[PDB]
Amino acid sequence: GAMGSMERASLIQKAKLAEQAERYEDMAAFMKGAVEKGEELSCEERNLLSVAYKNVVGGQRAAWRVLSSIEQKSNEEEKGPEVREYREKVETELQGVCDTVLGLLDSHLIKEAGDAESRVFYLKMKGDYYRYLAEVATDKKRIIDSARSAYQEAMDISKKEMPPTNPIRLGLALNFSVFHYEIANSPEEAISLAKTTFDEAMADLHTLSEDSYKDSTLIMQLLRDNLTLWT
Amino acid sequence: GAMGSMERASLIQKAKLAEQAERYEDMAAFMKGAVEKGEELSCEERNLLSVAYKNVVGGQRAAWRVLSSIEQKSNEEEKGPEVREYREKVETELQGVCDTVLGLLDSHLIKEAGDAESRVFYLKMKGDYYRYLAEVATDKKRIIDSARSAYQEAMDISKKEMPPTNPIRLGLALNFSVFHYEIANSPEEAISLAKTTFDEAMADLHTLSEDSYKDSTLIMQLLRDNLTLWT
Ligand SMILES: C=CC(C)(C)OC[C@H]1O[C@H](O[C@@H]2C3=C([C@H](C)CNC(=O)C4CC4)C[C@H](O)[C@]3(C)/C=C3/[C@@H](COC)CC[C@H]3[C@@H](C)[C@H]2O)[C@H](O)[C@@H](O)[C@@H]1O
Ligand SMILES: C=CC(C)(C)OC[C@H]1O[C@H](O[C@@H]2C3=C([C@H](C)CNC(=O)C4CC4)C[C@H](O)[C@]3(C)/C=C3/[C@@H](COC)CC[C@H]3[C@@H](C)[C@H]2O)[C@H](O)[C@@H](O)[C@@H]1O
Ligand SMILES: [Cl-]
Ligand SMILES: [Cl-]
Ligand code: NA
Ligand code: NA
Ligand code: NA
Ligand code: NA
């Protein structure tokens, strides 16, 4: 790989610089290089990995949605193949990034993660990137099943090993509920998961750390925001 | 080039789609392909070209400024070569984009542009991209002279052939005044140019078209904003 000649510590340092400069493609490349050094990632390093790729795919998803919207309208004046072609171009790029992330998770990170915090983190990521693949799929069924199984394994571990207000547990439940509502045609499951997650976190807030209070209350607010939209 | 197999009209269509999707790197590549078909660009097509590359280089400049700021602080604890290396990486990418734009202007567009509107537009772009090169240069003098000479030729034509409220004339004067203030160590020239430009546009506003009123009043407001900051 192009990062093979750079020190692991230098890759981490440059990932943090790329984050400050909002250079997320660079940031992802540095963190991919770090993962490929073969050592486990720390808590801080996992966050760098997830933020980098979340921002890269987030821009691709937003662009794909704009183009798909134009395409669907155009099939409601004929203007030729260009809209479809360019949507397909963005879609292929998006799929390539998802495949890259899923490859890192499957080749390096999930196998070696034993602590609940790392294992749930990586399984959530796996569910997230299969979900992004599902959004553009038309073996959609197989991709949806892959996302569900990854989220479900993460859920089983998080409920057994983490308190209800743990930010990773909360963010996993948020995204799994969105999967149910938006992807899997299961709005009732989505609502039930979001409500039980929120309610159980409320009663646990008297154990929540000052250092994670900001993250967890934010995610709790996103759960409430979705419940208000869905009900 | 990679766009050589695509119809000119398809490249223009996809540039407009890329703009709607905020995919400016794609947008620039499509417009570069269009320019390389060898035909002159229309007014609308020139705007697509300039917006695409302005957004690409704008993100590079913002990232370069963040990294340079970190670098300059670090030379006020030693942390090794990484900040300099990554700043150099972004800088080289930025210079490559500027060189690409300047190459398109010099190989295709400036020679064939005879109408005042196209010729002033392209000469302004030439000044702009030399200015972006000057911001990171440490043959800085030669680059600064190249920007000044391009802006000056554009200024001479615009005052001879365009009314004072023409948006291209106004935007050229805005950017040349910023060049004087920020690049060329000539704040008094910057202030004088901005003030005479603003004053002469005010007295011409009774000829300004309804269709260009929005563009010109916007640029006039930017001139006033700079005058307020500078005085
Ligand atoms: C490594 C350095 C950097 C700067 C990149 O870290 C970024 C953040 O990383 C931790 O937050 C993570 C985190 C957040 C929280 C919600 C950000 N909170 C706020 O906006 C509060 C208002 C102030 C969103 C991210 O996408 C990130 C890394 C991702 C996930 C997500 C990861 O699923 C695989 C599960 C939940 C959340 C969990 C993992 C959260 O714990 C820190 O705690 C935060 O301070 C910090 O901003
Ligand atoms: C081709 C399609 C697209 C959508 C890309 O066009 C974009 C714009 O292109 C023309 O505006 C150009 C223009 C603008 C104006 C100021 C945008 N105005 C507003 O925000 C008003 C509040 C509503 C900034 C750009 O960077 C662009 C293309 C660039 C320049 C600049 C080019 O130096 C080489 C000189 C001035 C300005 C001149 C050239 C202006 O005329 C239109 O008139 C605008 O409607 C339109 O938004
Ligand atoms: Cl395409
Ligand atoms: Cl680097
Ligand atoms: Na090493
Ligand atoms: Na077409
Ligand atoms: Na043709
Ligand atoms: Na270092």
PDB file of N, CA, C and O and ligand atoms in Angstrom, chain A residues 10 13, chain B residues 79-82, ligand 8:
ATOM      1  N   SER A  10       3.160   8.179  12.669  1.00  0.00           N
ATOM      2  CA  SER A  10       3.054   9.292  11.734  1.00  0.00           C
ATOM      3  C   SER A  10       1.712   9.273  11.011  1.00  0.00           C
ATOM      4  O   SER A  10       1.124  10.328  10.749  1.00  0.00           O
ATOM      5  N   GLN A  13      -0.809  10.637  13.459  1.00  0.00           N
ATOM      6  CA  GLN A  13      -0.635  12.084  13.561  1.00  0.00           C
ATOM      7  C   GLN A  13      -1.227  12.801  12.355  1.00  0.00           C
ATOM      8  O   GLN A  13      -1.880  13.841  12.503  1.00  0.00           O
TER       9      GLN A  13
ATOM     10  N   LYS B  79       7.904  17.925  17.185  1.00  0.00           N
ATOM     11  CA  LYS B  79       7.059  16.767  16.927  1.00  0.00           C
ATOM     12  C   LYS B  79       7.387  16.088  15.605  1.00  0.00           C
ATOM     13  O   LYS B  79       6.599  15.260  15.134  1.00  0.00           O
ATOM     14  N   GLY B  80       8.518  16.415  14.992  1.00  0.00           N
ATOM     15  CA  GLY B  80       8.960  15.714  13.815  1.00  0.00           C
ATOM     16  C   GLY B  80       8.459  16.329  12.529  1.00  0.00           C
ATOM     17  O   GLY B  80       7.878  17.422  12.512  1.00  0.00           O
ATOM     18  N   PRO B  81       8.669  15.622  11.418  1.00  0.00           N
ATOM     19  CA  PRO B  81       8.440  16.218  10.095  1.00  0.00           C
ATOM     20  C   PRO B  81       7.005  16.154   9.595  1.00  0.00           C
ATOM     21  O   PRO B  81       6.736  16.664   8.503  1.00  0.00           O
ATOM     22  N   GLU B  82       6.071  15.580  10.357  1.00  0.00           N
ATOM     23  CA  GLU B  82       4.779  15.217   9.782  1.00  0.00           C
ATOM     24  C   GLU B  82       3.963  16.439   9.368  1.00  0.00           C
ATOM     25  O   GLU B  82       3.340  16.436   8.301  1.00  0.00           O
TER      26      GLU B  82
HETATM   27 NA    NA C   8       6.178  12.955  14.815  1.00  0.00          NA
END
